[PDB]
Every structure is written in C-alpha cells, then in structure tokens.
Paper text:
The key molecular interface that enables T-cells to sense these threats is mediated by the clonally expressed T cell receptor (TCR) that classically distinguishes between self and foreign peptides. The finger-like CDR loops of the TCR are thought to meld around specific pMHCs, sampling the peptide cargo, and enabling T-cell triggering by ligands with sufficient affinity/dwell-time.
Indeed, for the [name] TCR, we observed Cα backbone flexibility in the CDR2β loop, shifting by up to 3.6 Å in different structures of the same protein. In both cases, these shifts were comparable to loop movements reported in several other studies in which the unbound and pMHC-bound TCRs were compared. Moreover, we also observed loop movement for the [name] TCR structures, which were solved at an average resolution of 1.55 Å, comparable to the higher resolution datasets for the 003 TCR. For the [name] TCR, only the CDR2α and CDR2β loops were free from any lattice contacts (data not shown). However, several other loops in both the [name] and HA1.7 TCR structures were also free from crystal lattice contacts and did not shift between structures. Thus, we conclude that these loop movements represent real differences in the conformation of the CDR loops of the HA1.7 and [name] TCRs due to the intrinsic flexibility of these regions. Although this analysis is an approximation and should be treated as such, the average maximal loop motion was slightly less (6.4 Å) for the 003 TCR compared to [name] (8.7 Å) and HA1.7 (9.0 Å), consistent with the structural data demonstrating greater rigidity in the 003 TCR.
Numbering used by the authors:
A (entry chain A): 1 to 99, 101 to 202
B (entry chain B): 1 to 240
The structure:
Amino acid sequence: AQSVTQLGSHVSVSEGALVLLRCNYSSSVPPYLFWYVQYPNQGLQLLLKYTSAATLVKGINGFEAEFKKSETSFHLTKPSAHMSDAAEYFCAVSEQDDKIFGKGTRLHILPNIQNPDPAVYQLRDSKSSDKSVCLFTDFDSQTNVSQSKDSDVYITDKCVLDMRSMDFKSNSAVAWSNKSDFACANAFNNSIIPEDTFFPS
Amino acid sequence: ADVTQTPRNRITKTGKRIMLECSQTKGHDRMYWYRQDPGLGLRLIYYSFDVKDINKGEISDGYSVSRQAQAKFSLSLESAIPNQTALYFCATSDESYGYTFGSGTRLTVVEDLNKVSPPEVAVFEPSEAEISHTQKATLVCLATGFYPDHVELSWWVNGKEVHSGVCTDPQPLKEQPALNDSRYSLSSRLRVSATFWQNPRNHFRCQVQFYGLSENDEWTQDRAKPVTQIVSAEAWGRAD
C-alpha cells in the first residue's frame, strides 16, 4: 500500500438510518484491509477485514464492507444507526509486506426526537453559597450550540444521554460563570435556539 | 499475546527519560509501537521482527527502542517534551497481519509540575421547573480547576457505577484559553425519573479520578500536594 484515506474527522448519521463510513486506498496490488472501532476510553477492536477471500466481508453486529478494486474502496456499512454505534472508526491497510492506519472518523448519531421540548433551566449547587449552572435541554438535532462570546462564560458542546429506564434520549448543553450579571436567560444568546424554548420563572 | 504494556497512565516532567514496556506470551517475531493523537490516527514509531532487527516508522524522532527478548519490546522517550503527550499502543502480529494490540498507555508530559492541580467537584441539583414540566430530573456535575487534562468521571447511585442516563463532555475545556498551562473544566449530566430523584432515600455521587503527582515527587508549595486521587460531590433526593 501507498496509503489509506478516510475523509471527515467527524460525521453524522440519523438514528435508525444506514451507516456508511467511506475508506479508499492506494495500492496497485490489492492489499489486505481492516476496519477497527474504538469506543471511548478503550482500546482498538477489529470489526472485519478483507484478506483476499470473500469480497463481501461480514463482521460483528451487522457490520459489512465490500472490497471494490475498481473504485479502490472498502466502505463500512451497517443497516441502522443505534446510539451505541457512537465511536471512532479506523480503516487500515497492509504495507511493505510487514505492517498502516487511516486518520479515523468519529461517528455521531443524531437521536430521533419525536416530541422536542426545548428549555433552559437553572440548577443549584448541592451546597454552595450560592453557585449555579444553566442547562439547555430537550431540543431536536436541528439545534446546535455555539461557543460563548463572553470569556467568563463557559458553554459545553451538546451531549446526548440515552436513558435506558424509559427508552428515552435527549440532548443538552451546560453553561456557567462566576460573573455577577450572568443570567440563564442570557446564557445561550450566541446560539440559535428554537423559537418555542421554555424559559421558566 | 496476552500483550501487556506498562505503565497504564503516567505524568512526567519535560526532560526526563521515560520507559514504556510491551510484553507478549505468544512469541510472535513481529512487535510494534504506535502513538495515537486526535485527527492523526495511529502512527508507527518503531518496529521489530526479531531480537536483531529494529526499523523506523514514520515518527521515530525523539524516541528509541530495544528488543531485549522475543517477548519484550521497550520504547523510550530520551528526553520527554510536551508534544510527546499521547496514547501509546504496542502490538504484535503473526505472519498474516493478525494484530494483537496492548490496552494502551496514556502519557502526559508537562513542563512545570508546580501547575498540577486536582479538580474541585460540585453537584447541581435538578430544577423544580424541569421536574414540573417533564417529570424528569437532570443532575449536573462540574469538575473545575484541574491540570493536566488527565481525568475519569463516573456516576454512582447506590454505591454501584451507572452508565444509563449519563452524558459526559468528550473533552474538557480550558478555563483560560489564552494560556499554554490553562486549567481545565469538565461537565456531566445524569438524568433520572422525577420519581427516582424524589425519593429522599436515594444518594447520588459524581466521582472524578484525577491523575497527578506520585509520592516520589518533590513538593515545595503550601497548598496540598496534587497527587493522583479521587474527588467526589454528592446529593440526596428531596421529597421536595
């Protein structure tokens, strides 16, 4: 192999939709090819590999990949995206008869949110005197959260929780500041939020 | 091939020699050391086909290796620098690209150990307004003021670790982005039924494992030595 190319460090798929992660290689002689997954905080696990036998290779969990010589590709697919598919995926190739990894792609699964109920809530320190944070939650995946424009205001990326007790998934982002004039009513002013976001009293 | 590597986690100062060790039980000729960095995948440092063969990979500069035995392949950072901060993976292979990877070594090189600092951790209780509006209750944990960026956060409800209902930020943010040795902060949420939160019998704990100094390290400040340690915060359910 000269090389292996995955493009898009971060990609999205809707929950329930076809997963397709793209890999291309450059090698005149067909190489062996590999897809590895890395779930967060863990090591690398082999999903499947092409080793010059079947061109349609099947791996665990309904993963498959077709080796296509004529388009120099080995795209990884799975029938339906589940929230537990959130991971980094690396395609890789044999080189110099003795050893190479693509740069990886992180798969983000957008939850199917049938009844969004966007809201900004204020939360109080269990102890404290008296600190608090603001929680933007329950929006669908047409909303994204922008980073803050006040350097004393901190705002996290949106994060999806999959609450198993009730088979319920939700998005949220957190904001906080030690500043005196910080109000949750203003915390997310640099983001485009739903026109019907709930702002309690 | 139980492939094992040591250490698992390590913090070091710039300029120290650091040694990482890979061992195997299956006696494969071929052993490898890779580093992983975000956006770059796994890059090969060095590799070896026998006790008498060492070969450079793409990023061998700053590193040396020794193949001391069929079973063992050692990686050294001769003089550690901050851009050597990374996850390091060793691997063995058979003669048909059947790789076995070790579980990883997380290495952080810092310039000045005086800046090491454990997190402050706080739990923020659910909004009454959320409870009323949704019949659900989101707890927030905040870990702040920590350095280096080398933590693990978990949630515990009745003394058992929980993964359901949780989301933790994938990376901490910098408290002072304009500073090379800025401290970090990290958030997490744990959502339960408003029923479960409502029970004044239920106990919730956010636990942060911090990786810092060891007992070996000199400490000259009046503040607490910032050793590897756990920092928690808790809350109890309210009837209301």
